Amino acid sequence: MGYYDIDDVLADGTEFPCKFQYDIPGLGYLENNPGRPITKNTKLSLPLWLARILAIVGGDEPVPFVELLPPDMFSTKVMNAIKTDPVALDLHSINSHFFSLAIKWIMLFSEKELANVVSELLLQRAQELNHHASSLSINTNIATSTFLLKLEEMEKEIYKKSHESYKDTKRWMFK
Amino acid sequence: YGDLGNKLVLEAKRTKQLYARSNQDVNLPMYHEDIIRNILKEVSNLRKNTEYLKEQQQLGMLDDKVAKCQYFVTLLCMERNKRCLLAYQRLRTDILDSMAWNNNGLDLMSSSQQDTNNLSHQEQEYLKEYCDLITDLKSGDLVDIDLSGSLVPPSDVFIDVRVLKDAGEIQTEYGVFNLIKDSQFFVRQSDVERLIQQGYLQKI
Amino acid sequence: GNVLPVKIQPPLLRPLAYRVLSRKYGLSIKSDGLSALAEFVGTNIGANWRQGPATIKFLEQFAAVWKQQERGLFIDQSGVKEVIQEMKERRDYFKVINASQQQRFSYNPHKMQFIFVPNKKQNGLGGIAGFLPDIEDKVQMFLTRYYLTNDRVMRNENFQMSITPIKNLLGRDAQNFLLLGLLNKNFKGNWSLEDPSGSVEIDISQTIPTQGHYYVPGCMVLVEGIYYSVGNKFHVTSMTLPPGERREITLETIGNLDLLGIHGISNNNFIARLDKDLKIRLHLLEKELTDHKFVILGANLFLDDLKIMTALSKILQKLNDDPPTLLIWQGSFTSVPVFASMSSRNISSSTQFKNNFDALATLLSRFDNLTENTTMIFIPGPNDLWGSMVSLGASGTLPQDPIPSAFTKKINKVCKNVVWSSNPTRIAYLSQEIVIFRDDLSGRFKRHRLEFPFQKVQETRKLVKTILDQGHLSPFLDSLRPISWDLDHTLTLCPIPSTMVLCDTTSAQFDLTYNGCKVINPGSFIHNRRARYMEYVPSSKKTIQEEI
Amino acid sequence: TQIYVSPQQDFSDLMKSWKNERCSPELLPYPHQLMKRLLNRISMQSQLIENISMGFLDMQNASNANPPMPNESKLPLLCMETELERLKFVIRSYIRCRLSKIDKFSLYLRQLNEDENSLISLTDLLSKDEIKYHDTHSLIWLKLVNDSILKYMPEELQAINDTEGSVNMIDEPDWNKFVFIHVNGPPDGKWNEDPLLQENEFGKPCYTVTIPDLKEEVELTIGSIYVMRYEVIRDLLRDDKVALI
Amino acid sequence: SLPAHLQQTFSPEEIQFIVENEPIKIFPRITTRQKIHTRWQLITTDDKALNNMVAMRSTEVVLWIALLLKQQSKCSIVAPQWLTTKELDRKIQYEKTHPDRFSELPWNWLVLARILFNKAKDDFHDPIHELRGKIQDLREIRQIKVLKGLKYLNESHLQLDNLSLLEINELRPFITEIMDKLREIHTASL
């Protein structure tokens, strides 16, 4: 949680499905005809940076104005996919802010069943990241590139840092 | 509504990658104050709208729940706009200070970017103030040690130096070096690092 | 050296100089710097090589003076000059400049910033022909003017409705719009508006213009109307010149750029700005300003007739007791244009022109206080030597050449401070910008007023409003007043001057002020058996006097 | 420190402090006395080398006489000057690292300083030049950001130290960051008089630390490198029990 | 210093410096015993050995002084007990016979080796290529053991009893970031 961090600011911008648990006249002006109010139980795709607050304010039965539905990224389908084989999964395709979004979602809703699986996922991916980082040139196969293009954005900085560390050590060793 | 702000923030990320790939402060790009003032005028619109809505809320014909939800939505919009703008500005200031710290605080316009026109006026006066602080810092208790010197540990005393640009002759302590074009020197390491940073010497 | 200088051995002083100039501040001491320091430690022999603080503080003052000039990595033969500066650091500061030496600055529409342009003389050879502008200059001159006007209009508070480029008017009809551009006559002979995008036609049958402006071809105008695709007529219903801006607001957009650089200048390598000494010089100008008065005379003081000479002699008789700071003579100095003489029997017109100024040198001999204490300024008139040679007294090129040296070989020797400049000339005071421009205005704007189908102090109000809102000295096309391709920037009113010396022989005297600037309207030097001239107090006050 | 056994002990302490500060995620206090001694040492050594060099130079330039014998003349002063350059490099790196650290956490330490209940005072952690650096830099940055953006902000949220709403904007140091340590043991040569160390099978004196989040106890023995979070290890580090790598 | 996050780890140059800041034994060629001359009188080293040396007698000086004298002809570096075949053989045997414990080897492993091989090529008793090959074998074996051990990464702590300097330096960022992310996940879950 850093105010001046670019990736967190970008990740706050993703849209999450949610429903109007409460009915408010005069709303929806910013999306549709302003004169027509929004009726109850209306599904919307609101950004995280406001959906996080509007679901906790209550306002007032001090129920919040909005009720947030389970997003499609966190689905039984994806859970099975990540559990069966994580090393070859193109998690980049599902979302490009997966890990920070997962942290925020698990922080909002404590769920012991996601922490362990996500931890195991990234732990298993770390070994292959190290494997590829150690390898250096001295004629190139498709496996390395097709792996590197599946990564999450937050793993790229670890990959680059490790690669630079190994390259610098090799350069110093051989002169 | 603040999606436009993301367009700014995303752009900033690219600039950081420009820093990352190069690993050297150089050629800082042109600012984006146009989108910034677009956000400023839209946030002025938001502020005047919020003030008006508070006016009608105090007037008595406006629903309390509507007033409060409008107020929260507008406040969140302002918060995100401010966050985006300061996120851009902090990175700009950081890279500016990084650039200013290593060139001995003299801005070196004679020989990075040439025009420095890609920086706002406020940024340029901030750069001048930071150069002032950089000059001030080494003038106090640490006068014997140049804080803007090298950072590579001294590993050897005598190195070969090959000339890169032509000049006349330059004095040193107990001697004088004539910078004839394209010659080689066998000199002490701790004498020519200043020239090397200036770009007048090559082949360390 | 000192009273007892001792010649040094350079090796032993080498460490003292090298340490200070290569470890704390500075870099790359040359041999010239070391020899200079040898001489100037000869000037500081007092207990030196055993006395630290004095030489060290002189060296740090040296550094504090040297490091503000460029980057100064090497010490060339200027070092003695900065040492003379050191000696001297232990009314001036005003400059007069002509349109020939004004710095060139382009304007870029894609970067919204002024760009320095190198002068052809400084970098080029200039020994054969360097004053000839290039072909694309006339292509880009109107582009530059339009870009500046567009920026000025769009900076307005009211406009944040938006105008539409001309070419984007093809696909719509029966809709109101707003647009601006050059106003002229098409090849066919109809009224048209031209824009970098394109051009359209104008319907005038029901136009209601904003009064107080001289709607003239060649002037930026704001047009509100309804397009009609049945023909190509943009039916106009309202029309007004764009509004103007004061000096400070236009300046702050570029902070305080060094356009008329006297303290410092910008060039290709770097851009410079300054506001610290502006308030100091303003405070300096606020005092003893009444002592530094400058007086101007009327227009067209012909030095051939006896009456003008007698009146001038009386003026100088009154003036010699109290010489002013600046004296300006404007208008032609000969009542007949000089040109080819087909007869050799009589005096050549060029020789007569030379003779007329010679008598003026003689008349200067009896007013020595004026010749000794007041500088002199001469501004060419419409039918002087170079112009009348091809213009024969009619209007010609505006960036007019100065008076030739060959015909002024005695005035320069009698007086001690005489400067000849172009017809548009700019002087730089401590905190004031003054421009002087001599030509005919009221007749020109009266004869070319646009016609609309449907107490003399109002005319000058209209003239001033038009010339200040347009922001260009010559709001006329190339048909009327041909302008040199590159020097057009001199006629631009970018950051408008503090005071304008607008002399028009066809207009009555006026002292109006508007939009942060004030304008003075001197008349002819003589009128109705009387002669007059005016003086302006730097405290924004004017006086008029008549001496017949 | 209170007194020096030898300047080499001072050098070792300086190097250990530099290593500790380089990897620490939190701004550590300021060892005034060490650099107080070291700057005087550097000045005196520089004066000596300059004096002897000037003596050689002026005896050489007053008359041709005899050039200095190449043996026992060049190499000693060469060693002095290269050692001085090395020490200057080390001190420069330390100072620049501290400057960057105080660059990062400026607002947090400022807001901590004004706290009356906070027993830690800004005077001890920083030198005077560092204090002026912090305050001037903070004012300059605040002026820049106020002119550029905050001038247009509404009255509600113009302050850049707000700690309410959604996101706080004060960057506390991460006390939980994992760091590499080396258990050096007690600085005493007895290395057995601490009231903290215990013993296990085959002797192996050890310290027992506890993690509250995991509710565990971790054993640390002498001569073993561990990877432990920074929070549980501040006291051992400040007592010179363990040295970071 | 920041210079692109150089404020978190050590560059190889700094490692080489901090290793050459260590004492070593020397076999001098010249004598500078005092007349019973210039005082060494350094500030970070006991000058007594420097002042009190005599030719063909063993004494201890810091590494970089020995290197500087080796650049001249006043030096003869004495290699440690590692740099010989019969010790490296028992070392590699120890690694082979114990597949879980890194062998006992100091922090300056392989760095003194690189420096001595680069500079003191001639003073050895053993051929250089044999020693270089055996050192390469040790490097490969320890690299394999490191990869084997890295499989399990607890979120609490870890023990790496016998890693040398460069081996820790190269691996620091990846390991640190992985455990930081794991700790963040666990703490957020509670």
Q: Give domain limits for chain B.
A: 1-150, 151-204
**Pairs from D48-54 (Cβ < 8 Å, separation ≥ 24):** D48/E41, D49/D77, D49/D80, D49/D81, D49/D84, D50/C15, D52/D77, D53/B174, D53/D77, D54/C12, D54/C15
Query: Does residue B87 contact residue A6 with C-beta atoms inside 8 Å?
Result: yes
Q: What is the largest CA-CA distance in chain B?
A: 90
What is the chain B residue with the closest CA to D47? B144
As to burial, measured by CB atoms within 10 angstroms (0-12 exposed, 13-18 middle, 19+ buried), residue D210 is: exposed
**N-term to C-term CA, chain E:** 36
Of all helices (H) and strands (E), which one includes residue D205?
A: strand D203-211
Q: What's the CA gap between C115 and C103, in Å, rounded?
A: 11
Phi, psi dihedral angles at D153 (to 5 degrees) = -70, 150
D123 residue type, one letter: T
Nearest CA-CA partner of C62 in C86, C38, C84, C31: C86
- Say how many C-beta atoms besides its own lie within 10 A of residue B169's C-beta: 12
C71 touches chain B (CB under 8 A): yes
Query: Does residue C441 contact residue C192 with C-beta atoms inside 8 Å?
Result: no
Q: What is the CATH number of domain D5-171?
A: 1.20.58.1030
Going from the C-alpha of A137 to that of each of A133, A166, B22, D65, E11, the distances in angstroms are 11, 12, 21, 62, 22
Q: In chain C, which residues have their Cβ closer than 8 Å to the Cβ of D58?
A: 12
Query: Does residue D197 contact residue D206 with C-beta atoms inside 8 Å?
Result: yes
Query: Does residue C364 contact residue C371 with C-beta atoms inside 8 Å?
Result: yes
Under an 8 A CB cutoff, do D133 and B133 touch?
yes
Q: Which sign does the torsion angle of CA E185, E186, E189, E190 carry?
A: negative
D164 touches chain A (CB under 8 A): no
Nearest CA-CA partner of E10 in D15, B177, B101, C474: D15
- The domain spans of chain C are 94-157+242-548, 161-241
Breaks (C-N over 2.5 A) in chain E follow: 36
Any alpha helices (H) in chain D, and if so which ranges?
A: 7-23, 32-62, 74-104, 106-113, 122-125, 128-148, 234-238
Under an 8 A CB cutoff, do E179 and D226 touch?
no
Q: What's the CA gap between C246 and C96, in Å, rounded?
A: 23
Q: What's the CA gap between C445 and C480, in Å, rounded?
A: 12
Q: What's the CA gap between C208 and B168, in Å, rounded?
A: 73
Query: Does residue B166 contact residue B181 with C-beta atoms inside 8 Å?
Result: yes
Query: Does residue C40 contact residue C59 with C-beta atoms inside 8 Å?
Result: no
Q: In chain E, which residues have their Cβ closer than 8 Å to the Cβ of B98?
A: 2-3
What resolution in angstrom units was achieved for this structure? 3.9
Beta strands in C337-491 (DSSP E): 375-379, 418-420, 425-428, 433-438
Under an 8 A CB cutoff, do D178 and E30 touch?
no
Under an 8 A CB cutoff, do E178 and A158 touch?
yes
Tokens standing for residue D233: 């290890």
Q: What's the CA gap between D101 and D27, in Å, rounded?
A: 7
Under an 8 A CB cutoff, do D129 and B140 touch?
yes
Residue C288 CB partners (closer than 8 Å, separation 6+): none
Q: What's the CA gap between D237 and D226, in Å, rounded?
A: 14
What is the dihedral angle through the alpha carbons of D141, D146, D149, D154, rounded to the nearest 10 degrees?
140
Tokens standing for residue B170: 């330059």
Q: What's the CA gap between C467 and C475, in Å, rounded?
A: 8
Q: Report the neighbours of B using a cutoff of 3 or more CB pairs below 8 angstroms.
A: A, C, D, E
* DSSP assignment string, C318-329: HHTTS--SEEEE
Nearest CA-CA partner of E42 in C99, D86, C376, B111: D86
Nearest CA-CA partner of D52 in B145, E41, E44: E41
**Pairs from A73-80 (Cβ < 8 Å, separation ≥ 24):** A73/A98, A73/A101, A74/A102, A74/A105, A74/A114, A79/A117
Q: Count H helices, E strands: chain A?
A: 8, 3
Shortest CA gap B49–chain D (Å): 12
**N-term to C-term CA, chain C:** 63
Bridge-based pairing state of the strands B169-172 and B175-178: antiparallel
B17 touches chain E (CB under 8 A): no
Q: Which sign does the torsion angle of CA D131, D137, D138, D139 carry?
A: positive
DSSP state of C336: S
What is the chain C residue with the closest CA to B172? C18
Tokens standing for residue E41: 């009188």
Considering only CB atoms, E174 lies closest to which of A99, A110, A158, namely A158
Q: How was this structure determined?
A: cryo-EM
As to burial, measured by CB atoms within 10 angstroms (0-12 exposed, 13-18 middle, 19+ buried), residue B140 is: exposed
DSSP state of A109: S
Query: Does residue C272 contact residue C258 with C-beta atoms inside 8 Å?
Result: yes
Q: What's the CA gap between C243 and B136, in Å, rounded?
A: 48
Tokens standing for residue C442: 């009221």
Q: In chain E, which residues have their Cβ closer than 8 Å to the Cβ of A165?
A: 9, 169-174
- Say how many C-beta atoms besides its own lie within 10 A of residue C207's C-beta: 19
Query: Does residue C474 contact residue C437 with C-beta atoms inside 8 Å?
Result: no
Bridge partner residues of C442 (DSSP): none
Q: What's the CA gap between C29 and C59, in Å, rounded?
A: 13
B52 touches chain D (CB under 8 A): no
Nearest CA-CA partner of B182 in B200, B204, B196, B198: B200
Nearest CA-CA partner of B9 in B30, B35, B42, B45: B35
Q: What's the CA gap between B123 and D86, in Å, rounded?
A: 36
- The domain spans of chain D are 5-171, 172-244
Shortest CA gap D18–chain A (Å): 21
C271 residue type, one letter: I
Nearest CA-CA partner of C520 in C439, C460, C442, C471: C460
**N-term to C-term CA, chain B:** 56
Query: Does residue B167 contact residue C10 with C-beta atoms inside 8 Å?
Result: no
Tokens standing for residue A113: 């069943």
Query: Does residue B191 contact residue C49 with C-beta atoms inside 8 Å?
Result: no
Q: What per-residue string of b and e applies to E52-67 under the rule 16 or more CB within 10 Å gives b? A: ebeeeeeeebbbbbbb
Tokens standing for residue A5: 């961090």
Nearest CA-CA partner of E171 in D176, D16, D180, D242: D180
- Say how many C-beta atoms besides its own lie within 10 A of residue E108's C-beta: 20
Q: What's the CA gap between C387 and C332, in Å, rounded?
A: 11
Query: Does residue E169 contact residue E10 with C-beta atoms inside 8 Å?
Result: yes
CA atoms within 13 A of residue D3's CA, in its CB half-sphere: 1
Under an 8 A CB cutoff, do D58 and C15 touch?
no
Q: What's the 3-state SS for C116-172?
A: EECCHHHHCCCCCCCCCCCCHHHHHHHHHHHHHHHHHHHCCCCCCCCCCCHHHHCCC
Any alpha helices (H) in C217-268, and if so which ranges?
A: 247-252
Q: What's the CA gap between E3 and B151, in Å, rounded?
A: 10
- Do chains E and D meet with 3 or more Cβ pairs nearer than 8 Å? yes
Any alpha helices (H) in A55-95, and if so which ranges?
A: 76-84, 91-94
Q: What is the largest CA-CA distance in chain C?
A: 99
Query: Does residue C534 contact residue C527 with C-beta atoms inside 8 Å?
Result: no
What is the chain B residue with the closest CA to D149? B85
Q: What per-residue string of b and e applies to D142-181 under the rule 16 or more CB within 10 Å gives b? A: eebbeebbbebbbeeeeebeeeeeebebebebeeebbbbb
Considering only CB atoms, A115 lies closest to which of E150, E170, E185, namely E185
Shortest CA gap C164–chain B (Å): 19
Chains B and D form CB pairs within 8 A to the count of 91
Question: 3-class SS at C28?
Answer: coil
Query: Does residue A28 contact residue A34 with C-beta atoms inside 8 Å?
Result: yes
A123 touches chain E (CB under 8 A): yes
Tokens standing for residue B74: 């507008």
As to burial, measured by CB atoms within 10 angstroms (0-12 exposed, 13-18 middle, 19+ buried), residue E168 is: buried
Residue pointed to by tokens 């302003």: A34
* DSSP assignment string, C179-222: EEEEEEE-SSS-EEEE-SS-EEEEE-TT-EEPSSS---TT--EE
Q: What's the CA gap between E145 and B202, in Å, rounded?
A: 43
Of all helices (H) and strands (E), which one includes residue C316?
A: helix C306-319
- Say how many C-beta atoms besides its own lie within 10 A of residue C412's C-beta: 14
Tokens standing for residue B134: 């950089």
Expressed as residue numbers, the domain containing E182 is: 2-190
Shortest CA gap D216–chain C (Å): 56
Under an 8 A CB cutoff, do B171 and C34 touch?
yes
Q: Which of B77, B83, B84, B88 to mutate to test the interface with A (most CBs of A within 10 A)?
A: B83
Breaks (C-N over 2.5 A) in chain B follow: 111
**Pairs from B170-177 (Cβ < 8 Å, separation ≥ 24):** B170/C28, B170/C29, B170/C30, B171/C14, B171/C17, B171/C18, B171/C29, B171/C30, B171/C31, B171/C33, B171/C34, B172/C18, B172/C22, B173/C14, B173/C15, B173/C18, B173/C19, B174/C11, B174/C14, B174/C15, B174/D53, B174/D57, B176/C31
- The angle subtended at Cα A101 by Cα A99 and Cα A106, nearest 5°, is 95
Q: Report the neighbours of D using a cutoff of 3 or more CB pairs below 8 angstroms.
A: A, B, C, E
B85 touches chain D (CB under 8 A): yes
**Pairs from C110-114 (Cβ < 8 Å, separation ≥ 24):** C111/B30, C111/B117, C112/C151, C113/B117, C113/C254, C114/C254, C114/C257
Query: Does residue B161 contact residue B201 with C-beta atoms inside 8 Å?
Result: yes
Phi, psi dihedral angles at B75 (to 5 degrees) = -60, -40
Going from the C-alpha of B189 to that of each of B176, C371, D94, E73, the distances in angstroms are 15, 66, 22, 21
Under an 8 A CB cutoff, do C15 and D61 touch?
no
Q: What's the CA gap between C236 and C225, in Å, rounded?
A: 4
Phi, psi dihedral angles at C434 (to 5 degrees) = -125, 135
Tokens standing for residue C332: 């032609």
Query: Does residue B122 contact residue B152 with C-beta atoms inside 8 Å?
Result: no
Q: What's the CA gap between B147 and B150, in Å, rounded?
A: 8
Of all helices (H) and strands (E), which one includes residue A98?
A: helix A98-108
Q: What is the largest CA-CA distance in chain A?
A: 75
Phi, psi dihedral angles at C210 (to 5 degrees) = -75, 120
- The angle subtended at Cα A38 by Cα A36 and Cα A43, nearest 5°, is 135
Residue pointed to by tokens 């820049």: D144
Under an 8 A CB cutoff, do D57 and C9 touch?
no
D167 touches chain A (CB under 8 A): yes
* DSSP assignment string, D56-81: HHHHHHH----PPPSTTTHHHHHHHH
Tokens standing for residue D88: 């200057």
Under an 8 A CB cutoff, do D140 and B129 touch?
yes
C160 touches chain B (CB under 8 A): yes
Q: In chain B, which residues have their Cβ closer than 8 Å to the Cβ of A59?
A: 65, 68-69, 72
Query: Does residue C290 contact residue C537 with C-beta atoms inside 8 Å?
Result: yes
B10 touches chain A (CB under 8 A): yes
Bridge-based pairing state of the strands C530-537 and D203-211: unpaired
Query: Does residue C333 contact residue C303 with C-beta atoms inside 8 Å?
Result: yes
Phi, psi dihedral angles at E59 (to 5 degrees) = -160, 165
Angle, in degrees to the nearest 10, between helices E12-20 and E63-71: 90
Nearest CA-CA partner of E132 in E189, E85, E168: E85
Structural domain count, chain E:
1
Bridge-based pairing state of the strands C233-240 and C199-203: parallel
Q: What's the CA gap between C525 and C533, in Å, rounded?
A: 7
Q: What's the CA gap between C395 and C443, in Å, rounded?
A: 13
